[PDB]
Amino acid sequence: RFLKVKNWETDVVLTDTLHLKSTLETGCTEHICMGSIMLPVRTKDQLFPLAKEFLDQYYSSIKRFGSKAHMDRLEEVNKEIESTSTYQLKDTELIYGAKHAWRNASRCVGRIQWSKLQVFDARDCTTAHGMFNYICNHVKYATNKGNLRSAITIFPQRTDGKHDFRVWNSQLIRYAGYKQPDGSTLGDPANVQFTEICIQQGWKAPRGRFDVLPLLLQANGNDPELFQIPPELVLEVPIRHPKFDWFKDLGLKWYGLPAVSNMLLEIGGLEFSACPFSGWYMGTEIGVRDYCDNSRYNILEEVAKKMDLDMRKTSSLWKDQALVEINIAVLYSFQSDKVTIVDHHSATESFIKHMENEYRCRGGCPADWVWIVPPMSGSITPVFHQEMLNYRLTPSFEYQPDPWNTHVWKG
Amino acid sequence: RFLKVKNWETDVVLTDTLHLKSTLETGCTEHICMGSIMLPTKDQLFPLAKEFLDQYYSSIKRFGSKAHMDRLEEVNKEIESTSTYQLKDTELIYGAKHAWRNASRCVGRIQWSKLQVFDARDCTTAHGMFNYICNHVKYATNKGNLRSAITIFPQRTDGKHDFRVWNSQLIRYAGYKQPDGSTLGDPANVQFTEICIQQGWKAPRGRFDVLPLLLQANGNDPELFQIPPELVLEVPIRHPKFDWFKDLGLKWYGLPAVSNMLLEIGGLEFSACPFSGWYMGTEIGVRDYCDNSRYNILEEVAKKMDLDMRKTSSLWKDQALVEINIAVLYSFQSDKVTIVDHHSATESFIKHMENEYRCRGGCPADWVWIVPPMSGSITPVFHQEMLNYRLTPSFEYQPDPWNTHVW
Ligand code: HEM
Ligand code: HEM
Ligand SMILES: CNCCCc1cncc(CCc2cc(C)cc(N)n2)c1
Ligand SMILES: C[C@H](O)[C@H](O)[C@H]1CNc2nc(N)[nH]c(=O)c2N1
Ligand SMILES: C[C@H](O)[C@H](O)[C@H]1CNc2nc(N)[nH]c(=O)c2N1
Ligand SMILES: [Zn+2]
């Protein structure tokens, strides 16, 4: 089967054959598209085909398909599965797997960088303290004094599902949110629930607008433990605007390192429930979503006031106008401080090239248009005009339930 | 099977049951989502008629009535005898309004029940069609106070007598390829303009030439007509702050009127059914003016604002884009032509969705099309999960007549 996608701006037509290797579900049917839906203990039975599929890909990629090394390895994994009910990846396979999970991540516009990923093998980790050490080293390495480096740290895989390693933080670095008795919110409204958990676990909250949350770390299915990331390791950027001198007085800053820590990495049927990964920010993530979502810091009003825009009619586009200045300021600030960041024009343009490269060399590039298109100025970026096919390949990053909803407390 | 949609801004969750009445396919499968793809007999006819008449009679609280059964009986006889059937005026109006209600790509659907339906099923010639379309244009425009309307021409018979408006929209600007290798006017309209010229149009070769209508009646060869200039309302584009903007020589037409689509009601097919409402600003300011394959004016505007266009990271493109869109809205409002900004329109649509979920059990919506082409996430629709599915009556895409027409 052949599937064509078209770019309506360029008339470039690409042919996808890669989707034939698609395994998991989409959520869609012939009767319904769930393309805008956010979120739509394994037996040896199901496990060996998954291992085999993965090992065949790995051996093909190193051009050793059907080799004795390939066959011996299948044999070794088979025996290990029938003996121990699971298996261990070689370091090479782990690295290959992590890189490909990123490569297959259909919601990530940053994938041109997929082959450059520093993989930190933390499978020898046994305790929360050990996890803390590993994560500190990840943060320091990735931050690199502002010259950001993509990295992932991989903690031991799931066994019976009762001994899971989990990072309870959705991201390694995030600001606390505090609900006030008057209904108002101090800090990041997104993180109110998690902050409360942290407080309940014994965290002493400074109760400011930009308090870096402590790490809440679960090793081997045990109760999670609190650790504070050494502040000297947390790179932050004061936000200012190149022309507006009052912008600094808004009191804004953000952290430089975007680091997802709540996702599950699947490789060859194995499940890595704690696998924090990081890259560098695209400006709009902060300037559009973090700052301007009504459900987040929500600064559009204040900014628009200070720019003295006409705010009586939406039709003045005062919101749009303020939004631009805020995103200019985020980009300006990071650049001025020499902290890696990319604008949505650069990032989407790079993605189109990556995508075309992938069609040519790989036969496709699964992409989720709904996530790939930036949250401002959509149609003046080239991804907007690009038809995309969304499907799911393994290895992959997957959503998993929040640990506080599933954890069995030891006490 | 009973699907939930969440708004991530408000945490509001809606339950959709309406999708279990969908029938047409989406393009998607359990293995592949095609949500971003632009274009993915008596036997066949009677169940379609029945399904439609059932929903019609349910809508007037007369389900299972004798009049319901009588109509069903009558339609069935007519299909058996004549191979097709004729809609009653009431049914036609119901169907047209519901086609719009079911248009999952339309953000303006809160207005769906206020639609003026012009029954042009008595039309027989292209001159007839021309007259009906002029009257539509004049009625819809209403001196700037726009009114939603659709004009419905005779249904398809054997497929060899189709009525077609060859133009994709009732009102659009011509496109010309220059010796300069560049493009004059609207680049999207070059091929159609060629066909107009080849059919005998005398093109003025200007940048904003209103295209002539190319009208096909009864499967005959299409004929040319110029819409009376005085009925084509246009808006010169100026900026409220930038005095120089006027000098760009920009204007646009007040009437957005889609003419290339197929209206399906009760299995019947209306291949010629132009419909119109009123513009959302971004349609003109973002797409028409700033698309690289359209009027593509970003660079010039940016230069007149003297922005640093050295580096993409200055966001000069984004800045110019906002001002271009400010000017569009200002110009329409100043000239008193109905227009809606994307904030107001998406807000309306959220309330409509909630109404539709509350009173109909759902609302089919294509998020890819509903979210505006600028400032996506500062509009409520961005944070609104939507289910996309196909309900009938419906507007459907159809092939361009020049690839179809046996001359
Ligand atoms: C290096 C530069 C990178 C850039 C510019 C980038 C860009 C982005 C952006 C803008 C998003 C959307 C985030 C959101 O809307 O919440 C995203 C999502 C995602 N990225 Fe990347 N990313 C980068 C690196 C990485 C790396 C290193 C990985 C994994 C090894 C990765 C995997 C993912 C995944 C799995 C998602 C989906 C997250 C979710 O569903 O919440 N990215 N990326
Ligand atoms: C009166 C105010 C209206 C507003 C504000 C509005 C808004 C819009 C917008 C912004 C689009 C996207 C168009 C594009 O991006 O090219 C659209 C598409 C559409 N509209 Fe509405 N519309 C209105 C009236 C109507 C009416 C009266 C009908 C039918 C009787 C209709 C049916 C449709 C259909 C079928 C589409 C999809 C067109 C396509 O797929 O090319 N709309 N509308
Ligand atoms: C999933 N919706 C909520 C996301 C909230 C959130 C909070 N902090 C950091 C991120 C980072 C997202 C992200 C991750 C990576 C790896 C790179 C990049 N440029 N961006 C996301
Ligand atoms: C409902 C909708 O899917 C939701 O708002 C999505 C839209 N696209 C997105 N795109 C990105 N990059 N990040 C997001 O969080 C979202 N949210
Ligand atoms: C590839 C993508 O589907 C295409 O660019 C779509 C995206 N969303 C759109 N949305 C609207 N309203 N109108 C359009 O023409 C498009 N084009
Ligand atoms: Zn889909």
From Swiss-Prot, chain B:
Where is this gene product found? Cell membrane, Sarcolemma; Cell projection, Dendritic spine
In its record, the post-translational modification comment is: Ubiquitinated; mediated by STUB1/CHIP in the presence of Hsp70 and Hsp40 (in vitro).
Binding positions for heme b per the UniProt entry: C106, Y397
Binding positions ((6R)-L-erythro-5,6,7,8-tetrahydrobiopterin): S36, V368, W369, F382
Tissue expression from the record: Isoform N-NOS-1 is expressed in brain and colorectum. Found in the Auerbach's plexus of the enteric nervous system. Isoform PNNOS is expressed in the penis, urethra, prostate, and skeletal muscle, and coexists with the cerebellar nnos in the pelvic plexus, bladder and liver, and is detectable in the cerebellum.
Q: Which residues bind L-arginine?
A: Q169, W278, Y279, E283
Q: Which gene produces this protein?
A: Nos1
**What protein family does this chain belong to?**
Belongs to the NOS family.
Consequence when changing Y279H: 50% decrease of nitric-oxide synthase activity
In the complete protein, the residues contained here run 299 to 716 of 1429
Q: What does the record note on quaternary structure? A: Homodimer. Interacts with DLG4 (via N-terminal tandem pair of PDZ domains); the interaction possibly being prevented by the association between NOS1 and CAPON. Forms a ternary complex with CAPON and RASD1. Forms a ternary complex with CAPON and SYN1. Interacts with ZDHHC23. Interacts with NOSIP; which may impair its synaptic location. Interacts with HTR4. Interacts with SLC6A4. Interacts with VAC14.
Described purpose of this protein according to its UniProt entry: Produces nitric oxide (NO) which is a messenger molecule with diverse functions throughout the body. In the brain and peripheral nervous system, NO displays many properties of a neurotransmitter. Inhibitory transmitter for non-adrenergic and non-cholinergic nerves in the colorectum. Probably has nitrosylase activity and mediates cysteine S-nitrosylation of cytoplasmic target proteins such SRR. Inhibitory transmitter for non-adrenergic and non-cholinergic nerves in the colorectum.
Report the domain remarks: The PDZ domain participates in protein-protein interaction, and is responsible for targeting nNos to synaptic membranes. Mediates interaction with VAC14.
**Organism annotation:** Rattus norvegicus (Rat)
- Please state what the protein is called: Nitric oxide synthase 1
- Tell me the superkingdom of the source: Eukaryota
Result, substituting Y279S: 30% decrease of nitric-oxide synthase activity
